[PDB]
Design a protein around this ligand. Structure first.
Ligand SMILES: Cc1cc2nc3c(=O)[nH]c(=O)nc-3n(C[C@H](O)[C@H](O)[C@H](O)COP(=O)(O)OP(=O)(O)OC[C@H]3O[C@@H](n4cnc5c(N)ncnc54)[C@H](O)[C@@H]3O)c2cc1C
Ligand SMILES: Cc1cc2nc3c(=O)[nH]c(=O)nc-3n(C[C@H](O)[C@H](O)[C@H](O)COP(=O)(O)OP(=O)(O)OC[C@H]3O[C@@H](n4cnc5c(N)ncnc54)[C@H](O)[C@@H]3O)c2cc1C
Ligand SMILES: N[C@@H](Cc1c[nH]c2ccccc12)C(=O)O
Ligand SMILES: N[C@@H](Cc1c[nH]c2ccccc12)C(=O)O
Lengths: 414, 411
């Protein structure tokens, strides 16, 4: 039993708990937090790669200019930042050299045709083949999706560090966590534990039913243990996709809005030799047409690649087919990317990867205002997610959603 | 995604099927795929370093009961240590009487041995005495209605802490020096070297025949959906898992009835082996309180081991939270020893594992050691199908027969 229950211990749920426990109105209300994983953090997942480097399987970078709440959170929890270097393309293709002009040329036509898919928009003016070549040169395959509009594309381009120069956003600075954003999650978790929150990690919420004034939750432990939990006030700090399992009629009983999703994949590789130093690639990113798409060389420590949408599914299928083939593909694509023979790319030492079936979730384009958090029209359950915000796909959005979700719960309590 | 042979389940059963099959000339060069829903092989064998290596799952074997298992340890160069928990040094008055009382009941297994163990003992001793006597053996499965009297004597005679009650105290016991995970690693390494490919982290959801072959639907632990085509399939999973698939288990396979019960272990370490003061090093106490069987391993750690309704008890306790869980343990340790709680220190670290289907078994028949689906030819492999249900030996026996059956399909 609890007075307040939050399901989801990513940055959104944890920040809800933090706001609530900071409020005098929550004094003497017990708070229980559930998550289906054994550790908090959600799509923030730091890992030490073979004892050599702390890497981010999920969220990896932030900008003080774009993400002031997150900057403040990092400072509040005494977390060390370091410069994030991948904010320009040192080695542009001929296509990439023309991107800023190509995008600028098209931008006045957003007024007339900006709601259509970015692919169709670019094709309207350049034709299919040219559009394909131009779009692909930015490294984010979401830009090819029918449900990513030209408007949304210019927003994506302007907010991602590697290609922010394309829309003249070079001034935004970027940082990463020296020892991983999991440290921020741990900091928040320690604060809310100290204030009396109780954590029940490794339980998946299966269903919710009202029952008198409150709610009865059915959960399952990752070891099979079934648990029923009664609460008076409920925040579901989970993404839109997660809202479906449950029997809460999402989204029709909430916004009636539509939500998009796309998958993400990151693969990190260590090597015996920091072989890329010789090609002056340390702390640089290459954006390529081949399936690696965006290739990052971190100092002299490791490299990684990052894909989305169709290409994230491509990679996860390759992983399913076997480790040997997956590594061989990476080696082949590294060689093509650099213009050197395959045998001149070494075999790797230790490597790790992560596929996120719903890595990014977001509000589809609408003329109808969408609040930062939602409420179930009959039961008053609150929904909290980065996806509900203008910062969907960024930690800042979760912090924004959590402020509003806490606000709504506090109004329910009052 | 395809194979000649597919094994689902990388516990000791499935891994041993792969080993047998890859050893056979008939499987030279065949493509063999092994799936498991977990990210590491071993199943109910799970070793861990307790901040000493400990066994969260299977923990002991006997050369006398378990010749196939002993032979595997010997074959894979796995070293053993003496398992000291084979007698009760601090017997209660009821425990002192167990051997005589079980002796007296034994002839009556001919007449009423298919009744539950509780009903069988109650028939002759009355409910209260029966309860007191059955409880003193420390295995709460002995109270279950699915456990016959004949099954209960088999259980009592095969468990090291109580084997003396049925005059089996000649049977010797060992643990793995480096953990049974080393044996699993050994087997995995041998089958990988022989060309087996592993897909760990995938849950088999369903199967259909696909003319000549089988089409499996699997899901990755990260949500990725995978279909796999194979020509020969072994489901090396327990009956509970089989019943979750769409393969009409148990009706199309044996029509026998299977049971299951949960297990729980909890391990604790401390700043001193405080139990050395009570001469408890390398002893086991069997008590009426919820800990039930309490083990003190040399001067290194202690652990407790419960089953059936008491495993559920502890798992609920964990769900309520770590503080209450650990204070419950401290309280029950004091009561078992007959000392004040203050004399028991707080632990430095602890770990626990609940297994919702820790033991699966055939209730009761010429039950073969591995099963075939009557129409589809899919083969089922589990310790539960054998006369050593709930022991690694049983998995090795089932694997022998599963491999034999599959090699028969192949020819
Ligand atoms: C590869 C990748 C890269 C990223 N890059 C960046 C970046 O560089 N910068 C940036 O700012 N952001 C980045 N993001 C986004 C950032 O990760 C998200 O905006 C943010 O972490 C979302 O937080 P959240 O708490 O709303 O949701 P989540 O982090 O998804 O947390 C939701 C939680 O709910 C739990 N849950 C769901 N359903 C249930 C259920 N039924 N029962 C119990 N628990 C449940 C989940 O286990 C999860 O822990 C990235 C994300 C990914 C995947
Ligand atoms: C607490 C405990 C103590 C024990 N003590 C001992 C002992 O001291 N001595 C002894 O000999 N034995 C002991 N055992 C028993 C022993 O562990 C089992 O007899 C043996 O490990 C069973 O092996 P198996 O391969 O048949 O089954 P399992 O080890 O259960 O292996 C089955 C595998 O199938 C996988 N799986 C199941 N369903 C699916 C699916 N749908 N898709 C994909 N994968 C699937 C599971 O992940 C699992 O890895 C103990 C067991 C427990 C739980
Ligand atoms: N902002 C995250 C995720 C993200 C938001 N929108 C996206 C569109 C495509 C791919 C990823 C994203 C990143 O830096 O990666
Ligand atoms: N043989 C295993 C498990 C086991 C088999 N049958 C049982 C009945 C009850 C409890 C445990 C068991 C052990 O040593 O623990």
């Amino acid at each position: 039993s609890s007075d307040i229950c939050i399901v989801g211990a990513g940055i959104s749920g944890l920040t809800c708990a933090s706001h609530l426990l900071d409020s005098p109105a929550c004094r003497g209300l017990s708070l229980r937090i559930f998550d289906m994983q054994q550790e908090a953090g959600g799509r923030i997942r730091s890992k030490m790669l073979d004892g050599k480097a702390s890497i981010e399987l999920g969220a990896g970078r932030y900008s003080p200019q774009l993400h002031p709440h997150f900057q403040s959170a990092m400072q509040h929890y005494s977390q060390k930042s370091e410069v994030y270097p991948f904010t320009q393309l040192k080695f542009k293709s001929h296509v990439q050299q023309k991107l800023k002009r190509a995008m600028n040329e098209l931008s006045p036509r957003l007024k007339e045709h900006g709601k259509e898919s970015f692919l169709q928009f670019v094709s309207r003016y350049q034709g299919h083949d040219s559009a394909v070549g131009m779009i692909r040169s930015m490294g984010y395959d979401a830009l090819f999706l029918p449900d990513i509009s030209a408007e949304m594309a210019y927003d994506i381009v302007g907010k991602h560090p590697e290609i922010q120069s394309v829309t003249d956003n070079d001034a935004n600075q970027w940082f990463a966590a020296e020892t991983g954003f999991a440290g921020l999650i741990q900091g928040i978790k320690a604060k809310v534990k100290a204030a009396g929150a109780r954590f029940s990690l490794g339980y998946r919420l299966l269903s919710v039913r009202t029952d008198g004034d409150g709610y009865l939750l059915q959960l399952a432990g990752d070891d099979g243990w079934k648990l029923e939990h009664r609460t008076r006030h409920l925040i579901l700090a989970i993404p839109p996709s997660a809202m479906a399992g449950l029997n809460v009629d999402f989204p029709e009983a909430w916004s009636g809005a539509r939500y998009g999703s796309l998958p993400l994949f990151k693969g990190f590789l260590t090597y015996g030799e920091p072989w890329w130093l010789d090609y002056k690639l340390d702390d640089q990113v290459l954006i390529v047409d081949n399936p690696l798409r965006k290739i990052y060389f971190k100092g002299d420590k490791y490299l990684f690649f990052y894909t989305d949408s169709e290409m994230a599914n491509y990679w996860r299928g390759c992983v399913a087919e076997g480790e040997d083939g997956y590594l061989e593909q990476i080696r082949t694509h590294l060689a093509s990317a650099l213009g050197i023979v395959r045998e001149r790319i070494p075999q790797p030492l230790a490597h790790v990867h992560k596929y996120w079936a719903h890595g990014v979730e977001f509000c589809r384009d609408s003329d109808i205002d969408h609040p930062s958090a939602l409420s179930h029209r009959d039961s008053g359950i609150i929904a909290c997610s980065d996806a509900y915000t203008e910062h969907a796909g960024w930690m800042e959005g979760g912090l924004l959603s959590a402020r509003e979700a806490s606000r709504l719960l506090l109004q329910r309590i009052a």
